[PDB]
Amino acid sequence: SIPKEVKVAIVGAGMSGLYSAWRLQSEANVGDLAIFERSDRTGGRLDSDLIEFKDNRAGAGSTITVKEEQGGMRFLFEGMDDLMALFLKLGLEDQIVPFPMNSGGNNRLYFRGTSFSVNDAEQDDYHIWSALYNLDPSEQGVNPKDIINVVFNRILQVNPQFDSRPEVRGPEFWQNFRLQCQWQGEPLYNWSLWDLLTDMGYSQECITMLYRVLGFNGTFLSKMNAGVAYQLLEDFPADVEFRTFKDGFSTLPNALVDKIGKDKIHLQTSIDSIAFDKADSKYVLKYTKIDQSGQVSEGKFKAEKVILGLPRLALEKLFIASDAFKQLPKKRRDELWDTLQSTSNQPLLKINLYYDTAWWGTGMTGRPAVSFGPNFADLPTGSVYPFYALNDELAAALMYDERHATPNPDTQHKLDGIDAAKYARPAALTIYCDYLNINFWSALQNKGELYHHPHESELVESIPSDIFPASEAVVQQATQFFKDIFNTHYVPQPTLTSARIWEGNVNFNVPENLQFGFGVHQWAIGANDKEVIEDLVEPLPNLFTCGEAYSDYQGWVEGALRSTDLVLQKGFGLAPLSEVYEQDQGRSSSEAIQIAYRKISNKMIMEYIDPNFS
Amino acid sequence: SIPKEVKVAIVGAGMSGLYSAWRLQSEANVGDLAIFERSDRTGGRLDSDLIEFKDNRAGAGSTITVKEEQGGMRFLFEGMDDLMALFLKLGLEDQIVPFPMNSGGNNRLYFRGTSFSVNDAEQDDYHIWSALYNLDPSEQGVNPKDIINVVFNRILQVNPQFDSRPEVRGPEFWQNFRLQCQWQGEPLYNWSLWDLLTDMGYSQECITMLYRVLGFNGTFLSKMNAGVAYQLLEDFPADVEFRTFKDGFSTLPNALVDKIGKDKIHLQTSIDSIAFDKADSKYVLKYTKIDQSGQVSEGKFKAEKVILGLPRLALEKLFIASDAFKQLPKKRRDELWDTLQSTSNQPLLKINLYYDTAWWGTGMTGRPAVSFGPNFADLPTGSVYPFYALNDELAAALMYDERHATPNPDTQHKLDGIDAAKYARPAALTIYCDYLNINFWSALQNKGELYHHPHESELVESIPSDIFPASEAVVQQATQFFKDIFNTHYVPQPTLTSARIWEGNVNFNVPENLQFGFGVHQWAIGANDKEVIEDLVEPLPNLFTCGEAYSDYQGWVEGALRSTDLVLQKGFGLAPLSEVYEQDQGRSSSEAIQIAYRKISNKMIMEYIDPNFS
Ligand SMILES: Cc1cc2nc3c(=O)[nH]c(=O)nc-3n(C[C@H](O)[C@H](O)[C@H](O)COP(=O)(O)OP(=O)(O)OC[C@H]3O[C@@H](n4cnc5c(N)ncnc54)[C@H](O)[C@@H]3O)c2cc1C
Ligand SMILES: Cc1cc2nc3c(=O)[nH]c(=O)nc-3n(C[C@H](O)[C@H](O)[C@H](O)COP(=O)(O)OP(=O)(O)OC[C@H]3O[C@@H](n4cnc5c(N)ncnc54)[C@H](O)[C@@H]3O)c2cc1C
Ligand SMILES: N[C@@H](Cc1c[nH]c2ccccc12)C(=O)O
Ligand SMILES: N[C@@H](Cc1c[nH]c2ccccc12)C(=O)O
């Protein structure tokens, strides 16, 4: 049942769509809204998986849960005040769990046919990098990642007009940085990073090292401008304490869905086009719906206000097919289209391979054990992240670890046993790559038969619906690369796999369960994103756009939430959530979230690690 | 003056547009046609330049001509029977001139921070490649280009069903090869080359070597399928005798324009959209024209038949905006759009830097002199081609050279003097790159002020209109790379520059003199190009498409001519030009063109080189 008129119609059940409805329902008393989502699931580019593997250990119908991510995975307590506030208001802070990013130096590196570890790379004044890359002398004997840091310091040094001092560096800093800082008279958003480093005098060998060693070469090789690329590159300092949700980032959209109500969300309902009814001053939304049989249905309805929570490629399709846009004057319709072109589409992929046990610990490799964080490579792999079966004791050990406490031998010995025990429980690896590496996996994933371990139903009885298997060719090649990266002869066959390629499609011959938007977005060269962002709040009267694609904080949910807030302000009077939080609570969401988390971490550690802890 | 009705309306004054009109006028007696071309020039992706530099030598108002290319540059006597026939029928064979591809081993190579020569690369069982790349043992001690050749032989070996024997290997061979040959059960057009080599067991180091060393990494990293990539990679054997026109490839479109008549060609006239008139069974073409003042004008006219000689991106724009397409049923309109998606857009660029004299000869470098052919590099340069001032004696020396004659000391000594004298006359370098390297130059060319040598009008009085200067940033970086590639401290400032980036635009904020289509196209993965090609001849009744993008021979003018021929056959009864030639002349265009050229080469050599020649 689809209503025939609504106060607010919400296109997109991703984060910005779900977030608009919750805030309008609860803070603006608007109850006659509806969300329309083309796919058969809510959450968009957030998509966690919970697999319940048959516990087939020796002394075991017992079940073991592994959380994995097909989309978004991590967040931070600083710089995401809207997201923190959103977590606190939904009471989801008790589920917050560490997301660690290193293995004390044992994370892997594979570059130019050579497998080694992070600790290895540091030896002898970072010698290995000088042996693999034909570096200029000024480029030798330093950690590659510190070259990005130094160049940032140099950009800040020659831009004293730009304040450069707020200890917490949020989206305003990064907007001003890319819009106000210059290099040699040209502001950074007119620069490509590749051009920038080159003009700074770096070798092409050095630039290739950097974009391979950071794992996400889009920052250098795509059309994104240099300013926004730095925002992304300085999002992962050495000392990052990322966090995540125990049951996966989907916890947050599902939690919003409980509060919205399944009855106002209309899945498998694509909004095909939008027209304006001059008579009763209403929008008219043509749609296409698939029921629970597969029986299609074209229909139409009205709405006083429209909210498009949609990324760039979705927004161009509607614009193309919508009379509300086509009947605009030549000048502004062309200007609006050109404005959609101002953020670059960034392809991303994640392929998850699950295993009954993990094979990258010292017991299986004979080498120092790999635990957590990106294993980078110049192979099509890009980066590889390990994921372990959910375990309360392990999360407390991780929680102890993000305190830089000095354990006594008793506690070091218990942390030892915990670090090792996880390799005996099921686990997973995510291959996570961007720009240059996409086409390698693309062609591989679409060729040949799909991968299924035999007696698969014996290994998992309930395979989630958002899981499309990796192709046999994808598993085959991914397995050779793992042997390379982890320097081991032994990489067994996965029990279960999923492949997800966030790269937007314009082909009508693709099932809906395989249509996915561009993984992330970043501002192109020449883009004045301050003008672009404000133009796209309400481009036609009572028609709004918002979401991550044209946001202040591209790449992150906070981008979507801050973009939506502009719509909720301009169209509905609502102040930014973080500001609403602070008036209501008397402290920031930052301080609240840190205090709440320290408490449950304090309790977790004492309960599991060191009964006599600080 | 634009007619209000025509028998045939031709959209696009590129090669396929101009070729349709000439053949319809002359062979089908159709005189009431008109060509409509959005830009202010004919010829499309053919675009030669003739610069007339002030001869400021010591013993000189004398003029020196340099030919250069912003688009297409070379062709072959075998495998391009339509093009040869077209040359013979227009009497352009007397202007055919060698296009040499090597310097006897002195062409440059720059890979991983190391500058060296082709002769150097051969030393010690191709050792240099093993020192620069971490190759598998089976990948060591062989010439990189011979790895592509061997893999081709292997593909042919395991496909004995595929005949694999015609000595002249034309578009049919390459269509059957990519459509009928398989690797491990999957046919090559379902494969990416990158996936293919990997599955064959090659290292990523080796694959990176290959795609850097061949200069056009699109074959490996883009979405083009493996079969069509091989067609391109085996277009440049070691023994290639390419040829070109003395005054540039534009000779051919200009020669067609003389025969069509400027009066039937309507420049600065974009066809915006197309509708069907059910009443008088006519198409209705909305257009936009700019007169000689800049005064725009929107109009409309009719035509009984429409011929779209347009590449993919142009074809999608019309399809989007045209009622003749939108009023098609849901199924076929979506099927037709999906069919447009089946050829991949391949960006290309050419930046030409002209110099008063050439600086890469031994007199200026102290190293073995560079003459002709690609200087490849893993720098954003890609490939660099030298171009010299037009000189009849030099072309005869080149003509002698494509005979593998053994000159006597008298003739070797005269060839010596000729080889060296060209460095004293003006010359040019073309940077010619694809896929991965485009974005480097893109962002550079659009940033900052444009390059002009001071007292430029003193150096060239008549700067052609199709020449947009290289940006100052482009010249600056291109000059550093030249010092790298040519291993010299000394690369002076260019007298004149041009930049051309064949990468299709969808932004309305770009002048017409800067809108250019995708440089070339190649079949994507999954594309059954036999079905696609025949579907796009006449997709609606009396509406035809043709050109290179969805052709049998992508990359080359012959592709455009063979694609058009299908339209001229199905819509107008005309047999393929090469077949028309043969009936009329009693021999192929291949044999005619070889015999005609041998004669004028025979005469050229005797006149300039060795009076007593074979
Ligand atoms: C691989 C990957 C990893 C990431 N990791 C992180 C991370 O660690 N941390 C972080 O903060 N962020 C991360 N992100 C980013 C985060 O996922 C996004 O910023 C955010 O979830 C996107 O929200 P959105 O509402 O802007 O868009 P979307 O999530 O893309 O929502 C758009 C929705 O609209 C629907 N839709 C489209 N067209 C129509 C139509 N015509 N009618 C109806 N519905 C339509 C789509 O199906 C989709 O559900 C990651 C993204 C990717 C791809
Ligand atoms: C860098 C480069 C080098 C090349 N080198 C070679 C080579 O050495 N040898 C070789 O054989 N080939 C070469 N080619 C390929 C060759 O240039 C092309 O195959 C051929 O010239 C293209 O002809 P076409 O008619 O298919 O398309 P185009 O040349 O692209 O013609 C399309 C024309 O239609 C016009 N147009 C577009 N939309 C509209 C509209 N709406 N209304 C009116 N007019 C419109 C465009 O302005 C253009 O003039 C090269 C190409 C490039 C880019
Ligand atoms: N938050 C993202 C990082 C990211 C944002 N935008 C991107 C663009 C390209 C590559 C990575 C990113 C992640 O967890 O991975
Ligand atoms: N004929 C083209 C070669 C070519 C055709 N298609 C291509 C695609 C990519 C790179 C090169 C090509 C040339 O002279 O350069």
Nearest to A506 among B186, B194, B341 (CB): B341
Nearest to B338 among A443, A444, A508 (CB): A508
Query: What kind of fold does domain B5-40+267-342+523-574 have according to CATH?
Result: FAD/NAD(P)-binding domain (3.50.50)
Q: What's the rounded Cα separation, in Å, for the pair B449 and B463?
A: 19
Nearest ligand 3 atom to the CA of A218 is: 9
Nearest CA in chain A to B185: A448
Query: What kind of fold does domain A5-40+267-344+523-574 have according to CATH?
Result: FAD/NAD(P)-binding domain (3.50.50)
Q: What's the rounded Cα separation, in Å, for the pair B353 and B496?
A: 6
Query: Quick check: B423 and B364 in contact, CB under 8 A?
Result: yes
Residue nearest to atom 3 of ligand 2 (CA): B72
Q: How close does chain A come to B134, measured CA to CA in Å?
A: 6
A555: left (phi over 0), alpha (psi -120 to 50) or beta: left
User: Which residues in chain A have Cβ-Cβ distances shorter than 8 Å to B225?
Assistant: 443
Q: Do A192 and B223 touch (CB under 8 A)?
A: no
What is the DSSP track for B536-573? SSSSBTTEEE-SSTTSSSTTSHHHHHHHHHHHHHHHH-
Q: In terms of Cα–Cα distance, which of B72, B1, B511 is closest to B262?
A: B1
Using alpha carbons only, give the angle B304, B308, B311 rounded to the nearest 5 degrees: 175
Q: Do B195 and A221 touch (CB under 8 A)?
A: no
Residue nearest to atom 4 of ligand 4 (CA): B555
User: Which residues in chain A have Cβ-Cβ distances shorter than 8 Å to B436?
Assistant: 221, 436
Q: What's the rounded Cα separation, in Å, for the pair B192 and A535?
A: 41
Residues 6+ apart with CB under 8 A from A543: A274, A283, A305, A306, A308, A324
Q: What's the rounded Cα separation, in Å, for the pair A601 and A605?
A: 6
Q: What's the rounded Cα separation, in Å, for the pair A12 and A43?
A: 9
Is the C-beta atom of B233 inside 6 A of ligand 4?
A: no
Q: What's the rounded Cα separation, in Å, for the pair B31 and B52?
A: 37
Query: Quick check: A275 and A543 in contact, CB under 8 A?
Result: no
Distance of CA A315 to the CA centre of its chain: 20
Nearest to A440 among B194, B203, B443 (CB): B194
Nearest CA in chain B to A184: B448
Q: Is B222 on the interface with A (CB under 8 A)?
A: yes
How far away, in angstroms, is B580 Cα from ligand 2 center? 25
Residues 6+ apart with CB under 8 A from A562: A82, A171, A551, A552, A553, A576
Nearest to B439 among A135, A192, A473 (CB): A192
User: Which residues in chain A have Cβ-Cβ distances shorter than 8 Å to B135?
Assistant: 113
Q: Is B341 on the interface with A (CB under 8 A)?
A: yes
CA-only gyration radius of chain B, Å = 25
Q: In terms of Cα–Cα distance, which of B206, B212, B217, B204 is closest to B109?
A: B212
Residue nearest to atom 13 of ligand 3 (CA): A72
Q: What's the rounded Cα separation, in Å, for the pair B411 and B611?
A: 10
Query: Quick check: A110 and A379 in contact, CB under 8 A?
Result: yes
Three-class DSSP labels, B106-119: CCEEEECCEEEEHH
Q: What's the rounded Cα separation, in Å, for the pair A358 and A365?
A: 10
> Helices in B133-183 by DSSP H: which ranges?
144-157, 171-180
Query: Quick check: B105 and B367 in contact, CB under 8 A?
Result: no
User: B523: which strand partners?
Assistant: B343
* A:B CB pairs within 8 Å: 118
Phi, psi torsion values for A165, nearest 5 degrees: -160, -30
Phi, psi torsion values for A362, nearest 5 degrees: -60, -30
- B78 burial (CB, 10 Å; 0-12 / 13-18 / 19+) is middle
Amino acid letter, residue A190: N
User: Which residues in chain B have Cβ-Cβ distances shorter than 8 Å to A347?
Assistant: none
Nearest CA in chain B to A208: B112
3-state secondary structure of A499: strand
Nearest CA in chain B to A190: B447
Provide the terminal-to-terminal Cα distance of chain A, rounded to the nearest Å: 57
The CATH code of the domain at A48-104+242-248+347-502 is 3.90.660
Determination technique for this PDB entry? X-ray
CA-only gyration radius of chain A, Å = 25
Sign of the CA dihedral with A300 first, then A305, A307, and A312 last: positive
Query: Quick check: B291 and B126 in contact, CB under 8 A?
Result: no
- Residues within 6 Å of ligand 1 by CB: A 11-17, 36-39, 44-46, 71-75, 270-271, 309-311, 314, 348, 350, 502, 517, 519-520, 547-548, 555-557, 559-560
B-facing residues of A in 423-452 (CB < 8 A) are 436, 439-440, 442-444, 446-448
Q: In terms of Cα–Cα distance, which of A597, A562, A599, A530 is closest to A80?
A: A562
Amino acid letter, residue B289: K
What is the stated resolution of the deposited model, in angstroms?
A: 2.4
Nearest to B506 among A135, A341, A444 (CB): A341
Q: Is A203 on the interface with B (CB under 8 A)?
A: yes
For chain B, the residue count is 614
- For the record, the structure tokens of A39 come out as 């796919």
- For the record, the structure tokens of B19 come out as 């070729």
CB atoms within 10 A of CB B593: 23
B110, B111, B112: best to mutate for the A interface, most A CBs within 10 A: B112
User: Which residues in chain A have Cβ-Cβ distances shorter than 8 Å to B113?
Assistant: 133-135, 203-205
* Proximal ligand: closest to the CA of A235: 3
- For the record, the structure tokens of A119 come out as 């600790």
Query: Quick check: A434 and A469 in contact, CB under 8 A?
Result: no
* Proximal ligand: closest to the CA of A73: 1
Three-class DSSP labels, B365-418: HCCCCCCCCCEEECCCCCEEEEEEECCHHHHHHHHHHHCCCCCCHHHHHHHHHH
| Extents of the domains making up chain A | 5-40+267-344+523-574, 48-104+242-248+347-502, 133-233
Is the C-beta atom of B555 inside 6 A of ligand 4?
A: yes
How do beta strands B282-290 and B269-277 pair? Answer: antiparallel
Query: Quick check: B565 and B574 in contact, CB under 8 A?
Result: yes
- B527 burial (CB, 10 Å; 0-12 / 13-18 / 19+) is buried
Amino acid letter, residue A383: S
- A612 burial (CB, 10 Å; 0-12 / 13-18 / 19+) is exposed
3-state secondary structure of A596: helix
Q: What's the rounded Cα separation, in Å, for the pair B184 and A448?
A: 10
Q: What's the rounded Cα separation, in Å, for the pair A389 and A533?
A: 41
Query: Quick check: B334 and A508 in contact, CB under 8 A?
Result: yes
Give the H/E segment covering residue A481: helix A472-486
User: B302: which strand partners?
Assistant: B5, B284
